[PDB]
Design a protein around this ligand. Sequence first.
Ligand SMILES: [Zn+2]
Ligand SMILES: [Zn+2]
Length: 114
Amino acid sequence: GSSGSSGEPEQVIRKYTEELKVAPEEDCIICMEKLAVASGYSDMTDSKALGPMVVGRLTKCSHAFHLLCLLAMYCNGNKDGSLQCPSCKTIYGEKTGTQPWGKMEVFRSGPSSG
Ligand SMILES: [Zn+2]
Ligand SMILES: [Zn+2]
């Protein structure tokens, strides 16, 4: 009696990101908007469980990021029961630490965020 080996992406996000009582003084690079304000993807994404206002901080690099924005990026394509920070590039699923497969090979998809 079991289903959904992995489960859902909505949970994975929180599993790596811990919701904060109140959005910190950080700035979301994913949408380039102040955490204080709603999420930029709020329009594109229409999830019920998650929310645009909702904000949390990771458990690795402790970087604040719109719990929603993270889901949008993960769902966009990277849906392998994992999550990587678009800031410090820290993986939580694949491998917590070293880079993915040594030196990722970006041919068409190459994120440019400092
Ligand atoms: Zn955001
Ligand atoms: Zn980070």
